[PDB]
Amino acid sequence: QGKITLYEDRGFQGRHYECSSDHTNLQPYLSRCNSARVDSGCWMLYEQPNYSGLQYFLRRGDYADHQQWMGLSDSVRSCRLIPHSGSHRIRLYEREDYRGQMIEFTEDCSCLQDRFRFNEIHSLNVLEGSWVLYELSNYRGRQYLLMPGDYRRYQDWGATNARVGSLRRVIDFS
């Protein structure tokens, strides 16, 4: 279940901490977390503790700096593990609940505008692992996270809007 080595200082220096499970406060272990090494899994970090604020999606790889994982701010005080899943399947819904149009995805969607018309997703049903939504295509903007569950609106995943441009599955193994 994921396994990364968060480093207070870049180049994997300074104080370090290994996270193999959900964590809400990285302060008591990392002053800033300027570097991170992932073994196998997907991880998300949050600029503020208790998963609140701007975050950064991390996948198997070496990060000697915060800029590597898109770290905008080295003020990372929270990090969690996003579960995986052998198969991947998700059902997005146009409007709230399930009265609008629905389209399913079982693979990477670097260009939703090619698969679904409406750009507003106000409900989705994630059966397998988890997925990620991007305000644009080919991930050139913001990103949201949908854990395995049921959503009846866009606010459920704490989103100002529904505008979705692309999406992928949070997995690279099972």
PDB file of C-alpha atoms in Angstrom:
ATOM      1  CA  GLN A   1       0.000   0.000   0.000  1.00  0.00           C
ATOM      2  CA  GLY A   2       2.191   2.759  -1.395  1.00  0.00           C
ATOM      3  CA  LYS A   3       5.567   3.555   0.104  1.00  0.00           C
ATOM      4  CA  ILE A   4       7.385   6.866  -0.354  1.00  0.00           C
ATOM      5  CA  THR A   5      10.207   8.645   1.466  1.00  0.00           C
ATOM      6  CA  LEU A   6       9.353  12.250   2.043  1.00  0.00           C
ATOM      7  CA  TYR A   7      12.463  14.405   2.535  1.00  0.00           C
ATOM      8  CA  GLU A   8      12.488  17.717   4.342  1.00  0.00           C
ATOM      9  CA  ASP A   9      15.328  18.961   2.132  1.00  0.00           C
ATOM     10  CA  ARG A  10      15.763  18.512  -1.595  1.00  0.00           C
ATOM     11  CA  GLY A  11      18.202  16.039  -3.088  1.00  0.00           C
ATOM     12  CA  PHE A  12      16.637  13.730  -0.539  1.00  0.00           C
ATOM     13  CA  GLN A  13      18.591  15.411   2.271  1.00  0.00           C
ATOM     14  CA  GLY A  14      17.753  16.805   5.678  1.00  0.00           C
ATOM     15  CA  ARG A  15      15.144  15.037   7.790  1.00  0.00           C
ATOM     16  CA  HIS A  16      13.195  12.227   6.076  1.00  0.00           C
ATOM     17  CA  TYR A  17       9.985  10.296   6.710  1.00  0.00           C
ATOM     18  CA  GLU A  18       8.491   7.145   5.152  1.00  0.00           C
ATOM     19  CA  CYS A  19       4.700   7.048   4.572  1.00  0.00           C
ATOM     20  CA  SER A  20       2.993   3.735   3.719  1.00  0.00           C
ATOM     21  CA  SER A  21      -0.429   4.849   4.936  1.00  0.00           C
ATOM     22  CA  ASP A  22      -2.758   7.831   5.247  1.00  0.00           C
ATOM     23  CA  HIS A  23      -1.214  10.828   7.074  1.00  0.00           C
ATOM     24  CA  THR A  24      -2.737  14.183   8.095  1.00  0.00           C
ATOM     25  CA  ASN A  25       0.176  16.040   9.661  1.00  0.00           C
ATOM     26  CA  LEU A  26       3.651  16.039   8.030  1.00  0.00           C
ATOM     27  CA  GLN A  27       4.903  18.869  10.212  1.00  0.00           C
ATOM     28  CA  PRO A  28       5.853  16.578  13.167  1.00  0.00           C
ATOM     29  CA  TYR A  29       8.162  14.753  10.699  1.00  0.00           C
ATOM     30  CA  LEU A  30       8.994  17.175   7.855  1.00  0.00           C
ATOM     31  CA  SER A  31       9.645  20.882   8.058  1.00  0.00           C
ATOM     32  CA  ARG A  32       8.815  21.341   4.364  1.00  0.00           C
ATOM     33  CA  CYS A  33       9.205  18.111   2.329  1.00  0.00           C
ATOM     34  CA  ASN A  34      11.243  19.340  -0.638  1.00  0.00           C
ATOM     35  CA  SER A  35      11.902  15.839  -1.964  1.00  0.00           C
ATOM     36  CA  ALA A  36      10.080  12.532  -2.170  1.00  0.00           C
ATOM     37  CA  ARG A  37      10.745   9.025  -3.442  1.00  0.00           C
ATOM     38  CA  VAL A  38       7.855   6.722  -4.366  1.00  0.00           C
ATOM     39  CA  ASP A  39       8.302   2.946  -4.574  1.00  0.00           C
ATOM     40  CA  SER A  40       4.952   1.812  -5.968  1.00  0.00           C
ATOM     41  CA  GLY A  41       1.654   3.627  -5.538  1.00  0.00           C
ATOM     42  CA  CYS A  42      -0.057   6.993  -5.906  1.00  0.00           C
ATOM     43  CA  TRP A  43       0.291   9.701  -3.263  1.00  0.00           C
ATOM     44  CA  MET A  44      -1.219  13.136  -2.704  1.00  0.00           C
ATOM     45  CA  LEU A  45       0.268  15.865  -0.508  1.00  0.00           C
ATOM     46  CA  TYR A  46      -1.519  18.938   0.891  1.00  0.00           C
ATOM     47  CA  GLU A  47      -0.023  22.332   1.636  1.00  0.00           C
ATOM     48  CA  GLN A  48      -1.987  22.344   4.934  1.00  0.00           C
ATOM     49  CA  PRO A  49      -2.654  19.472   7.426  1.00  0.00           C
ATOM     50  CA  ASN A  50      -5.860  17.395   7.478  1.00  0.00           C
ATOM     51  CA  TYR A  51      -6.107  17.431   3.679  1.00  0.00           C
ATOM     52  CA  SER A  52      -7.041  21.075   3.179  1.00  0.00           C
ATOM     53  CA  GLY A  53      -5.516  23.340   0.512  1.00  0.00           C
ATOM     54  CA  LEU A  54      -3.487  23.007  -2.676  1.00  0.00           C
ATOM     55  CA  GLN A  55      -2.147  19.465  -3.172  1.00  0.00           C
ATOM     56  CA  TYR A  56       0.140  17.555  -5.571  1.00  0.00           C
ATOM     57  CA  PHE A  57      -0.363  14.145  -7.209  1.00  0.00           C
ATOM     58  CA  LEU A  58       2.665  11.817  -6.959  1.00  0.00           C
ATOM     59  CA  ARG A  59       3.326   8.469  -8.675  1.00  0.00           C
ATOM     60  CA  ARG A  60       6.172   5.919  -8.689  1.00  0.00           C
ATOM     61  CA  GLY A  61       9.306   8.004  -9.290  1.00  0.00           C
ATOM     62  CA  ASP A  62      12.088  10.087  -7.691  1.00  0.00           C
ATOM     63  CA  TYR A  63      11.519  13.692  -6.598  1.00  0.00           C
ATOM     64  CA  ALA A  64      14.630  15.527  -5.471  1.00  0.00           C
ATOM     65  CA  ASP A  65      12.729  18.787  -5.317  1.00  0.00           C
ATOM     66  CA  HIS A  66       9.149  19.960  -4.770  1.00  0.00           C
ATOM     67  CA  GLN A  67       9.031  21.333  -8.307  1.00  0.00           C
ATOM     68  CA  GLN A  68       9.392  17.771  -9.577  1.00  0.00           C
ATOM     69  CA  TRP A  69       5.940  16.708  -8.332  1.00  0.00           C
ATOM     70  CA  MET A  70       4.477  20.034  -9.373  1.00  0.00           C
ATOM     71  CA  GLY A  71       5.006  21.125  -5.816  1.00  0.00           C
ATOM     72  CA  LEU A  72       4.015  24.724  -6.001  1.00  0.00           C
ATOM     73  CA  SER A  73       4.740  25.242  -2.299  1.00  0.00           C
ATOM     74  CA  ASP A  74       7.207  23.322  -0.123  1.00  0.00           C
ATOM     75  CA  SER A  75       4.734  23.859   2.723  1.00  0.00           C
ATOM     76  CA  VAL A  76       3.528  20.287   2.704  1.00  0.00           C
ATOM     77  CA  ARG A  77       1.907  19.399   6.020  1.00  0.00           C
ATOM     78  CA  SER A  78      -0.316  16.479   4.957  1.00  0.00           C
ATOM     79  CA  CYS A  79      -0.081  13.422   2.766  1.00  0.00           C
ATOM     80  CA  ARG A  80      -2.212  10.373   2.094  1.00  0.00           C
ATOM     81  CA  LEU A  81      -2.261   7.171   0.092  1.00  0.00           C
ATOM     82  CA  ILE A  82      -4.778   6.727  -2.725  1.00  0.00           C
ATOM     83  CA  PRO A  83      -5.851   3.005  -2.961  1.00  0.00           C
ATOM     84  CA  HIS A  84      -5.511   1.177  -6.266  1.00  0.00           C
ATOM     85  CA  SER A  85      -7.518  -1.588  -7.929  1.00  0.00           C
ATOM     86  CA  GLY A  86      -6.914  -4.425 -10.386  1.00  0.00           C
ATOM     87  CA  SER A  87      -9.561  -3.192 -12.823  1.00  0.00           C
ATOM     88  CA  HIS A  88     -10.595   0.426 -13.384  1.00  0.00           C
ATOM     89  CA  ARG A  89     -14.122   1.660 -14.085  1.00  0.00           C
ATOM     90  CA  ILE A  90     -15.951   4.934 -13.358  1.00  0.00           C
ATOM     91  CA  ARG A  91     -19.384   6.365 -14.359  1.00  0.00           C
ATOM     92  CA  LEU A  92     -19.607  10.161 -14.665  1.00  0.00           C
ATOM     93  CA  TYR A  93     -23.018  11.869 -14.728  1.00  0.00           C
ATOM     94  CA  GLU A  94     -23.889  15.146 -16.390  1.00  0.00           C
ATOM     95  CA  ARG A  95     -26.286  16.659 -13.814  1.00  0.00           C
ATOM     96  CA  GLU A  96     -26.792  16.017 -10.104  1.00  0.00           C
ATOM     97  CA  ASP A  97     -27.887  12.652  -8.882  1.00  0.00           C
ATOM     98  CA  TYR A  98     -28.375  10.507 -11.960  1.00  0.00           C
ATOM     99  CA  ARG A  99     -31.022  12.157 -14.156  1.00  0.00           C
ATOM    100  CA  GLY A 100     -28.617  13.517 -16.763  1.00  0.00           C
ATOM    101  CA  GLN A 101     -26.390  11.852 -19.334  1.00  0.00           C
ATOM    102  CA  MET A 102     -23.857   9.235 -18.208  1.00  0.00           C
ATOM    103  CA  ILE A 103     -20.606   8.046 -19.818  1.00  0.00           C
ATOM    104  CA  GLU A 104     -18.227   5.347 -18.439  1.00  0.00           C
ATOM    105  CA  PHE A 105     -14.397   5.278 -18.423  1.00  0.00           C
ATOM    106  CA  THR A 106     -12.060   2.315 -17.964  1.00  0.00           C
ATOM    107  CA  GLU A 107      -8.837   3.975 -19.130  1.00  0.00           C
ATOM    108  CA  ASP A 108      -6.883   7.224 -19.292  1.00  0.00           C
ATOM    109  CA  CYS A 109      -8.845  10.197 -20.633  1.00  0.00           C
ATOM    110  CA  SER A 110      -6.355  12.880 -21.701  1.00  0.00           C
ATOM    111  CA  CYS A 111      -9.093  14.435 -23.817  1.00  0.00           C
ATOM    112  CA  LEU A 112     -12.600  13.992 -22.449  1.00  0.00           C
ATOM    113  CA  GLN A 113     -14.000  16.539 -24.944  1.00  0.00           C
ATOM    114  CA  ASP A 114     -13.530  13.689 -27.408  1.00  0.00           C
ATOM    115  CA  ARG A 115     -15.508  11.176 -25.363  1.00  0.00           C
ATOM    116  CA  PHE A 116     -18.283  13.230 -23.704  1.00  0.00           C
ATOM    117  CA  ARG A 117     -20.072  16.430 -24.759  1.00  0.00           C
ATOM    118  CA  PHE A 118     -21.111  18.350 -21.639  1.00  0.00           C
ATOM    119  CA  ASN A 119     -18.078  19.691 -19.844  1.00  0.00           C
ATOM    120  CA  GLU A 120     -19.947  19.712 -16.508  1.00  0.00           C
ATOM    121  CA  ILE A 121     -19.846  16.591 -14.315  1.00  0.00           C
ATOM    122  CA  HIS A 122     -22.140  16.917 -11.283  1.00  0.00           C
ATOM    123  CA  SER A 123     -22.084  13.326 -10.092  1.00  0.00           C
ATOM    124  CA  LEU A 124     -19.990  10.245 -10.635  1.00  0.00           C
ATOM    125  CA  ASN A 125     -19.809   6.657  -9.450  1.00  0.00           C
ATOM    126  CA  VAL A 126     -16.324   5.249  -8.885  1.00  0.00           C
ATOM    127  CA  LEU A 127     -16.526   1.458  -8.609  1.00  0.00           C
ATOM    128  CA  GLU A 128     -12.856   0.451  -8.731  1.00  0.00           C
ATOM    129  CA  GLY A 129      -9.874   2.328  -7.326  1.00  0.00           C
ATOM    130  CA  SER A 130      -9.763   6.104  -7.626  1.00  0.00           C
ATOM    131  CA  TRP A 131      -9.566   8.595 -10.485  1.00  0.00           C
ATOM    132  CA  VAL A 132      -8.441  12.166 -11.152  1.00  0.00           C
ATOM    133  CA  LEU A 133     -10.313  14.969 -13.001  1.00  0.00           C
ATOM    134  CA  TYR A 134      -8.526  17.818 -14.834  1.00  0.00           C
ATOM    135  CA  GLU A 135     -10.022  21.239 -15.500  1.00  0.00           C
ATOM    136  CA  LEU A 136      -8.587  20.863 -19.074  1.00  0.00           C
ATOM    137  CA  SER A 137      -7.195  18.270 -21.484  1.00  0.00           C
ATOM    138  CA  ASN A 138      -3.876  16.451 -21.265  1.00  0.00           C
ATOM    139  CA  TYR A 139      -3.699  17.681 -17.655  1.00  0.00           C
ATOM    140  CA  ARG A 140      -2.688  21.346 -18.306  1.00  0.00           C
ATOM    141  CA  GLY A 141      -4.430  22.944 -15.316  1.00  0.00           C
ATOM    142  CA  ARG A 142      -6.018  21.954 -12.008  1.00  0.00           C
ATOM    143  CA  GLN A 143      -6.867  18.453 -10.833  1.00  0.00           C
ATOM    144  CA  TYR A 144      -9.422  16.835  -8.488  1.00  0.00           C
ATOM    145  CA  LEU A 145      -9.489  13.411  -6.753  1.00  0.00           C
ATOM    146  CA  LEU A 146     -12.436  10.945  -6.623  1.00  0.00           C
ATOM    147  CA  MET A 147     -12.013   8.096  -4.089  1.00  0.00           C
ATOM    148  CA  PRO A 148     -14.028   4.805  -4.504  1.00  0.00           C
ATOM    149  CA  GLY A 149     -17.642   5.742  -3.702  1.00  0.00           C
ATOM    150  CA  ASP A 150     -20.761   7.618  -4.872  1.00  0.00           C
ATOM    151  CA  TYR A 151     -21.130  11.311  -5.745  1.00  0.00           C
ATOM    152  CA  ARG A 152     -24.466  13.141  -6.288  1.00  0.00           C
ATOM    153  CA  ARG A 153     -22.974  16.504  -7.136  1.00  0.00           C
ATOM    154  CA  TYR A 154     -19.810  18.422  -7.885  1.00  0.00           C
ATOM    155  CA  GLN A 155     -19.545  19.789  -4.361  1.00  0.00           C
ATOM    156  CA  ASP A 156     -19.163  16.281  -2.981  1.00  0.00           C
ATOM    157  CA  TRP A 157     -15.450  16.306  -3.965  1.00  0.00           C
ATOM    158  CA  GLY A 158     -15.280  19.921  -2.836  1.00  0.00           C
ATOM    159  CA  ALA A 159     -15.228  21.601  -6.256  1.00  0.00           C
ATOM    160  CA  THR A 160     -16.093  25.188  -7.133  1.00  0.00           C
ATOM    161  CA  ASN A 161     -17.448  23.954 -10.458  1.00  0.00           C
ATOM    162  CA  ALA A 162     -17.946  20.824 -12.566  1.00  0.00           C
ATOM    163  CA  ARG A 163     -15.835  21.835 -15.556  1.00  0.00           C
ATOM    164  CA  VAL A 164     -13.937  18.660 -16.481  1.00  0.00           C
ATOM    165  CA  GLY A 165     -11.534  18.476 -19.430  1.00  0.00           C
ATOM    166  CA  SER A 166      -9.822  15.102 -18.852  1.00  0.00           C
ATOM    167  CA  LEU A 167      -9.397  12.295 -16.298  1.00  0.00           C
ATOM    168  CA  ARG A 168      -7.323   9.217 -15.483  1.00  0.00           C
ATOM    169  CA  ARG A 169      -7.206   6.256 -13.117  1.00  0.00           C
ATOM    170  CA  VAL A 170      -5.004   6.568 -10.027  1.00  0.00           C
ATOM    171  CA  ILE A 171      -3.105   3.355 -10.736  1.00  0.00           C
ATOM    172  CA  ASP A 172       0.091   2.181 -12.366  1.00  0.00           C
ATOM    173  CA  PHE A 173       0.198  -1.380 -11.092  1.00  0.00           C
ATOM    174  CA  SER A 174      -3.015  -3.214 -10.150  1.00  0.00           C
TER     175      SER A 174
END
